Design a protein around this ligand. Structure first.
Ligand SMILES: CCCCCCCCCCCCCCCCCC(=O)OC[C@H](COP(=O)([O-])OCC(O)COP(=O)([O-])OC[C@@H](COC(=O)CCCCCCCCCCCCCCCCC)OC(=O)CCCCCCCCCCCCCCCCC)OC(=O)CCCCCCCCCCCCCCCCC
Ligand SMILES: CCCCCCCCCCCCCCCCC[C@@H](O)O[C@H](CO[C@H](O)CCCCCCCCCCCCCCC)COP(=O)(O)OCC[N+](C)(C)C
Ligand SMILES: CCCCCCCC/C=C\CCCCCCCC(=O)OC[C@H](COP(=O)(O)OCCN)OC(=O)CCCCCCC/C=C\CCCCCCCC
Lengths: 446, 106, 54, 57, 418, 51, 32, 54
């Protein structure tokens, strides 16, 4: 019958084969009648210099809009025919082209990806569609709050770091770039082993490989002219960022201290902390006077509209942090408690709280891993990360690995006396000035 | 074991209730208990009519303590006329307290 | 535009004796404290002149 | 096929004691906002946007 | 890696249970109850109830419920369509045993403390105001009140004036009644089925037969136009449609999927929509034109749903209905018919595939049809649909009386007929 | 008064002991430094303010 | 909007040990 | 009120120079104080917590 061990071993593992041009292939055999083909290209926003800051977003917005093989309306009508849900996005660091689709269409789907990534046709009228749409879209993105807050957070916590600039990039840079340089972007970044083929489902692995072989074999691997990107272990500034805007109905805020990179052993216990802080939102009947302690007081005195703990991790470095919406008169108040929570994690972190956070974490994993697309993505990102699909038995051995001593140590190594990087979009006015904010990172009692 | 001795026990419960001053105040035993945070919330557990009753009765009692005249004994709360509608609410409160705290320490 | 309420100079006193609510039932016993206050003021003014010559 | 999700239209709200109070149904999206003029509602004691239930590391 | 042990009980309660190797142990206890069961006299007992899911039970303090959730790491959520409320709980396989009892204990007989109820009457305001934050939503609870006499015209949420006047007693009514043990149907998953009957019987004995379940509610032509300041009116036009589970309803499905359920190309285009191509050629871009169709067990409501500029919404809704007429002309290429059938299959495959859509699906047929089924049979009956029967459904939507709704600027958004 | 008792409280005091015990040592030695206490100054090789 | 905002230079105010854009801050938290 | 008696007793002893009979009255006065405040009254209030069945 049902037991945790079946939850452990019922999951099949991916294979990791590789092409001549270095493209690697992986796909768990999920025995799933539907399948989501995927290629998570490793190119991303942090890579480009300021000259071509938004190029990945541009290509993101014109992959299917024009391909060299067939007119884009033909490919469009094709996907409309197949009934497959095509999809694509781009993080700061993981550009992604993947097609949710039927297993029956699979060879058509993969070659269709070959039609996408390997080549694109760029009508200057189509490029004009790119430009006028995005230039009309910027203003819409300004209208959004959360993104703009995190945009300041990345724009300030890192500053001179390549990672700091906006993914879409500058309003002016976008109304400038040449078609040719875009092709240059494609030709310097969109090549293996940056690409990582994946498609968990009922797809048969060997057929997937053989199918890849007919298309992506053509794809380049050698870098042009021996030009070769190299990276930095980028510095983390602690500068605070305080945008105001009084006319906006609510203050809207995110704090973030420096975190571990997207390949760091301590990230799992840190994830537990995200549960330990326990995120909140206005809708819940789960708050009232319960939930997590900060969520509790936020629900008790109607502090927070909502707040969300988060643990972003880029390959070099992460960002431990929190994000609350807030009424003007309680701005400091949520803060007044929030930093304490970090110190609460420092000294006197009860193991009961620890197991609470671990359980919520495990639930977060299993909840993430439902469905085809999410796990195709897991295959599509874990390889870029550690490599590996990093199996859940390992993750949960690693969750059992955590102890309150280790928790207090890591929290000490990040929360206990460390310079905050804070960003706000409000109006903010109640919010304490940096030192005062900085004052809270260390208890006077300890 | 115990039998009619208990009858004597509620006997002195009755007589000492007479000995109690609030008996002469026309005040229910619920009326006299101190408003600790538990008790306040217990008052806010109350249905509106019992609220307005405890309110107005305590008010008349205070008015009589201001003009310093005692109630007529005819108007005394009788030992058997009284209700005890704070008690369930109270027991709820303490149980919630023990629950939240034993949950806390564990 | 109350000269009492609006004007800060005396507002604490409006917070104090001028218009603090107090229970309808109070014996002489609660008056005793204020008596003690007046006695204290008298101890000051008396001890003061004492020092004026002592 | 009688599930509302299989026949886009009527709402199937899923309010909860833990996860953010998700609700609503298509009423198709995405390609609406991209064409010019589409402010999207913002901040009136608003519940958190985007929502994150699929965390990893 | 299995098919479920489908159930009936002498007291009646489906307990489907798809045993799996899947870690995400879950159950989704269901109720046939919803907003439709109420009349004008007591709107919104429903929504306050769905929020009353958080309340203390006879079996546990609300403290012990909320703590009992978060500590184990498991969690709960409440789906509640008009046709069915749907309690749901999710967790680890060795941890389901306690949590399952919670929802049982949740669905047992929680006391409806008056202070707690007035306290959640606070929650009602926020939760309603944020639920309707969507411009689309502004049409939908509206639109159902536009095309219906009562039950299906009921709002999922109590109107704000009703809120304080919503009472615990009405909750006692709707719970003591419509929450029938028969109407309800548990849907286990990661747990083995036979044990699921066991603990369920702790509660399954509760509650007597049926409930009021009257007032079928029937179509009316009534226009509703709220008028707001939005630049982008979202006009929608609907004739009543056959529903549900009828082959004709399948024809409505093929019909709307000719338009498409929604875009398949994010940050792109959707040419396979027929009406959208019909309008965009005649109208400047800032709009959307898309399929819509209510499909209640009692009745359905097919119609165009049309996001639009207030400057020229009428050109959009007219060109769209013109295209619908073009299908109703008998004027139909068969290519996009089969393509639409393929869309039927695809969308159904995805909606089935995710565990949420899977379980909600399984309950959605089990609550009414009472028949657990592999999807492939559904694919067979859905590919069985006649190509001309599409022309039939088009003829019906052109035929039936047309309730219309379009909250927004209402500058140039002409009433149905006149 | 019984609330002070508890499974976390034992662990909690266990945790807080180093910080507050350190203060006592700091407070004690500092207080000796402030009153310029005698007999311990006998025991210091360096700080003998006495000849 | 959120795009065209930028952080103007502070390097002249920065400590020499963190003055460059490549180095770890955490390496310098101790000395600083 | 018995405590009132104990304290006034301490005053009247306070006028009285140290003497044996007042030594016995001395320790008796002290112990009387201790038991009157520290212990007795709360136990009484417990007893009427029973009588009032609090
Ligand atoms: C009666 C029962 C006692 C209860 C005490 C509970 C323990 C907590 C406590 O005492 O807080 C002080 C403090 C707790 O600070 P915390 O742990 O960081 O948490 C406080 C929260 O931030 C609370 O938030 P916060 O905003 O209040 O924190 C800001 C800061 C307050 O600092 C200020 O802004 C006040 C500055 C006024 C100076 C004006 C100078 C004018 C010329 O916090 C303090 O109160 C510490 C000030 C240090 C001086 C002590 C003032 C006592 C009056 O504990 C100590 O200072 C003791 C350790 C160091 C003292 C040396 C002892 C050597 C022997
Ligand atoms: C330090 C230890 C001290 C121990 C003893 C303390 C004793 C305290 C005594 C002081 C307390 C106040 C005394 C109570 C007086 C009763 C009130 C009486 O004065 O009437 C008031 C009237 O007071 C005056 O109107 C106040 C304004 C006028 C003041 C003008 C001063 C005139 C004489 C001052 C002489 C100063 C000469 C200085 C030359 C350089 C109004 O109050 P009220 O009880 O409601 O009367 C209602 C009747 N109405 C309608 C007529 C009003
Ligand atoms: C047993 C336990 C006993 C513990 C008692 C501890 C009290 C000892 C000293 C208390 C004096 C408080 C004045 C300190 C002033 C001060 O706050 O300086 C800043 C510093 C840290 O502040 P934050 O960084 O904001 O803390 C945030 C922590 N999250 O706090 C300090 O304790 C350092 C003190 C240095 C500042 C000196 C100025 C203090 C004010 C002096 C005015 C006194 C005038 C009174 C005169 C009256 C004469 C009759």
């Amino acid at each position: 019958t049902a037991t945790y061990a079946q939850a452990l071993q019922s999951v099949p593992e991916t294979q990791v084969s590789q092409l001549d041009n270095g493209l690697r292939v992986a796909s768990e055999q999920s025995s799933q009648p539907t399948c989501t083909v995927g290629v998570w290209i490793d190119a991303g926003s942090r890579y480009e210099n300021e000259k071509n800051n938004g190029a990945g977003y541009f290509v993101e917005h014109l992959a299917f809009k024009g391909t060299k093989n067939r007119p884009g309306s033909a490919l469009e009508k094709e996907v409309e025919s197949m009934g497959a849900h095509l999809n694509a996005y781009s993080t700061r660091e993981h550009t992604a082209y993947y097609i949710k689709a039927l297993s029956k269409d699979l060879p058509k789907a993969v070659e269709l990806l070959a039609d996408i990534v390997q080549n694109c046709s760029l009508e200057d009228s189509q490029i004009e569609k790119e430009r006028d749409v995005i230039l009309q879209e910027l203003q819409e993105n300004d209208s959004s709050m959360r993104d703009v807050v995190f945009d300041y957070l990345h724009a300030t916590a890192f500053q001179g770091t390549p990672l700091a600039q906006s993914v879409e990039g500058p309003s002016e840079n976008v109304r400038k770039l040449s078609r040719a340089d875009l092709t240059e972007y494609v030709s310097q970044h969109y090549k293996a082993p940056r690409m990582v083929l994946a498609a968990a489902g009922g797809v048969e692995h060997r057929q997937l490989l053989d199918l890849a072989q007919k298309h992506f074999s053509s794809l380049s691997g050698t870098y042009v002219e021996d030009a070769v990107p190299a990276f930095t272990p980028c510095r983390f500034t602690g500068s605070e960022i305080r945008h105001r805007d009084d006319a906006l109905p609510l203050a809207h805020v995110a704090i973030a201290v420096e975190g571990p990179g997207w390949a760091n052993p301590d990230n799992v216990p840190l994830q537990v902390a995200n549960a330990i802080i326990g995120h909140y939102d206005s809708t819940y009947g789960g708050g009232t006077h319960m939930s997590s302690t900060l969520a509790s007081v936020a629900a008790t005195r109607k502090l927070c509209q909502s707040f969300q703990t988060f643990n972003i991790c880029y390959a070099e470095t992460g960002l431990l942090g929190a994000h609350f919406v807030c009424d003007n008169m309680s701005i400091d108040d949520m803060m007044f408690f929030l930093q304490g929570q970090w110190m609460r994690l420092c000294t006197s972190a009860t193991e009961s709280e620890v197991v609470r956070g671990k359980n919520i974490l495990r639930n977060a994993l299993v909840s993430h891993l439902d469905g085809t697309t999410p796990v195709c993505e897991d295959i599509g990102r874990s390889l870029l990360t550690y490599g590996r699909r990093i199996p859940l038995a390992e993750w949960e051995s690693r969750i059992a690995e955590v102890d309150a001593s280790v928790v207090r140590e890591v929290c000490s190594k990040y929360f206990y006396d460390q310079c905050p990087a804070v960003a706000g979009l409000g109006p903010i006015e109640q919010l304490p000035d940096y030192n005062r904010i900085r004052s809270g990172m260390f208890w006077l009692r300890f | 074991a115990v039998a009619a001795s208990s009858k004597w026990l509620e006997g002195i419960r009755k007589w000492y209730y007479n000995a109690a001053g609030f008996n002469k105040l026309g005040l229910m035993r619920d009326d006299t208990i101190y408003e600790d945070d538990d008790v306040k919330e217990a008052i806010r557990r109350l249905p509106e009519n019992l609220y307005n009753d405890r309110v107005f009765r305590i008010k008349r009692a205070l008015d009589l303590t201001m003009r310093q005249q005692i109630l007529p004994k005819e108007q005394w709360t009788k030992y058997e006329e009284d209700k005890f509608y704070l008690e369930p609410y109270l027991k709820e409160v303490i149980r919630e307290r023990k629950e939240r705290e034993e949950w806390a320490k564990k | 535009t109350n000269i009492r309420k609006s004007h800060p100079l005396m507002k604490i006193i409006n917070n104090a004796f001028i218009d603090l609510p107090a229970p309808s039932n109070i014996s002489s016993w609660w008056n005793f404290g204020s008596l003690l206050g007046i006695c204290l003021i008298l101890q000051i003014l008396t001890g003061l002149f004492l020092a004026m010559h002592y | 096929m009688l599930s509302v999700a299989s026949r886009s239209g009527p709402f199937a709200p899923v309010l909860s004691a833990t996860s953010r109070g998700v609700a609503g149904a298509l009423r198709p999206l995405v390609q609406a906002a991209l064409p010019a003029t589409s402010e999207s509602p913002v901040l009136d004691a608003k519940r958190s946007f985007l929502c994150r239930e699929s965390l990893s590391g | 890696p299995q098919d479920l042990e489908f159930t009936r009980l002498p007291n009646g309660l489906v307990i489907a249970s798809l045993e799996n190797y899947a870690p995400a142990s879950r159950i989704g206890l269901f109720i046939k109850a919803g907003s439709r069961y109420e009349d004008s006299n007591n709107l919104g007992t429903s929504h306050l109830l769905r929020l009353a899911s958080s309340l203390t039970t006879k079996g546990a303090s609300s403290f012990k419920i909320t703590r009992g959730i978060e500590a184990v790491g498991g969690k709960l959520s409440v789906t509640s369509t008009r046709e069915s409320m749907a309690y749901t709980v999710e967790c680890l396989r060795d941890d389901i045993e306690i949590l399952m009892e919670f929802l049982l204990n949740v669905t047992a007989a929680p006391e409806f403390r008056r202070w707690e109820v007035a306290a959640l009457q606070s929650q009602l305001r926020i939760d309603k105001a944020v639920a309707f934050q969507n411009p689309q939503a502004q049409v939908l609870e509206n639109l159902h009140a536009a095309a219906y006499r009562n039950a299906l015209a009921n709002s999922l949420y109590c109107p704000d004036y009703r809120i304080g006047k919503v009472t615990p007693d009405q909750l006692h009514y709707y719970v003591q009644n419509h929450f029938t043990s028969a109407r309800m149907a548990l849907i286990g998953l990661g747990v083995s089925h036979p044990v699921l009957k066991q603990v369920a019987e702790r509660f399954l004995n509760m509650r007597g037969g049926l409930g009021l379940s009257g007032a079928k509610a029937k179509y009316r032509g009534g226009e509703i136009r709220d008028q707001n300041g939005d630049s982008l009116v979202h006009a929608a036009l609907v004739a009543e449609s056959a529903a549900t589970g009828s082959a004709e309803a399948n024809a409505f499905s093929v019909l709307q999927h000719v338009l498409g359920a929604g875009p398949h190309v994010k940050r792109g285009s959707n040419a396979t929509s027929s009406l959208y191509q019909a309008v965009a050629k005649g109208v400047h871009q800032p709009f959307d034109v898309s399929a819509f169709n209510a499909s209640y067990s009692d009745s359905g409501l097919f119609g165009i749903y049309t996001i639009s500029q207030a400057a020229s919404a009428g050109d959009v809704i007219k060109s769209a209905y013109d295209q619908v007429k073009a299908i109703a002309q008998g004027n139909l290429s068969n290519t996009d018919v089969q393509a639409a059938k393929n869309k039927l299959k695809a969308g159904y495959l995805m909606s089935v595939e995710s565990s949420e859509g899977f379980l909600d699906e399984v309950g959605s047929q089990a609550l009414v049809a009472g028949s657990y089924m592999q999807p492939s049979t559904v694919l067979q009956q859905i590919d069985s649909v006649a190509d001309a029967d599409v022309i039939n459904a088009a003829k019906k939507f052109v035929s039936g009386r047309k309730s219309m709704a379009a909250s927004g600027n209402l500058g140039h958004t002409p009433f149905v007929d006149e | 008064l019984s609330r002070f008792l508890g499974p976390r409280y034992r662990e909690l005091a266990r945790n807080w002991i180093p910080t507050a015990s350190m203060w006592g040592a700091v407070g004690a030695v500092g207080l000796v430094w402030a009153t310029d206490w005698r007999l311990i100054l006998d025991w210091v090789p360096y700080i003998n303010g006495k000849f | 909007s959120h795009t065209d905002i930028r952080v103007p230079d502070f390097s002249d105010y920065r400590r020499a040990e963190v003055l460059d854009s490549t180095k770890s801050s955490k390496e310098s938290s101790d000395a600083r | 009120w018995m405590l009132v008696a104990d304290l006034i007793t301490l005053t009247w002893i306070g006028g009285q120079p140290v003497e044996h009979p007042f030594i016995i009255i001395g320790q008796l006065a002290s112990i009387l104080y201790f038991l009157i405040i520290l212990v007795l009254m709360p136990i009484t209030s417990i007893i009427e917590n029973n009588l009032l069945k609090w």
